[PDB]
Amino acid sequence: ERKKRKQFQDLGRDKSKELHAIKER
Amino acid sequence: FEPLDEDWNEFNDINKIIIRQPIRTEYKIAFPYLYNNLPHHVHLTWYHT
């Protein structure tokens, strides 16, 4: 729990076109 | 050229279709009766010389 607390504390301190072709087909 | 809306059936199930390579229009034109639905007025091209 102290480790989790220290961790929480110091974190604040073409292809689309060919798929479009398949979908249109 | 100017031109001379289908429901989901058991036949066009895309879960049955394996999509591996995209099928193009020249595949439909070279082989007019294998990949075409309603192939009405197509003409058979020459194969090879």
Point out residues after which chain A has a gap (C–N over 2.5 Å): 13
Resolution limit, Å: 4.6
Establish if B17 touches chain A: CB-CB under 8 angstroms.
no
Q: Which residues of B8-29 are buried (b: 16+ CB within 10 A; e: fewer)?
A: eeeeeeeeeeeeeeeeeeeeee
Quote the Cα angle for B35-B32-B11, to 5°.
25
B32 Cβ contact partners less than 8 Å away, ≥ 6 residues apart: B39, B42, B43, B44
What was the structure determination method? cryo-EM
- Assess contact for B36 and B42: CB atoms under 8 A: yes
* B22: chain A residues, CB-CB within 8 Å: 18, 21-22, 25
Q: Search chain B and give the residue with CA nearest A25.
A: B23
Establish if A24 touches chain B: CB-CB under 8 angstroms.
no
